[PDB]
Amino acid sequence: KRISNCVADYSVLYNSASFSTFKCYGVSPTKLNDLCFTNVYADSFVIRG
Amino acid sequence: DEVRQIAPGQTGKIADYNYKLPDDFTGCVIAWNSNNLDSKVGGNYNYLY
Numbered sequence: 001k002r003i004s005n006c007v008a009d010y011s012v013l014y015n016s017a018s019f020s021t022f023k024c025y026g027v028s029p030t031k032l033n034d035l036c037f038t039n040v041y042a043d044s045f046v047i048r049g
Numbered sequence: 050d051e052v053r054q055i056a057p058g059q060t061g062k063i064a065d066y067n068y069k070l071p072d073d074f075t076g077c078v079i080a081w082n083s084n085n086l087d088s089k090v091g092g093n094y095n096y097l098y
Contacts, residue, residue, distance in 0.1 A: 030060060
């Protein structure tokens with residue numbers, strides 16, 4: 001799914017403890033709120049653990 | 050699960066509200082399960098964060 005033309009508040013996503021794994025490889029989650037992007041690609045799927 | 054937030058350079062609600070290590074930490078971390086020692090079926094709510 002292509003996300004564009006909006007404001008993303010990743011702080012709530014990070015603050016949700018329901019996520020077992022969260023890893024950002026080119027950025028830090030804290031800095032995300034202060035960093036603007038061109039466009040985002042949310043790719044979803046279900047995998048084995 | 051928080052046993053990973055303990056290591057230096059980490060971040061999270063534990064690392065941002067209650068207990069935070071330094072980036073240059075020099076020392077040794079030791080951890081062992083104490084479920085049988087300090088857990089009850091009804092919920093040992095004596096441990097807060």
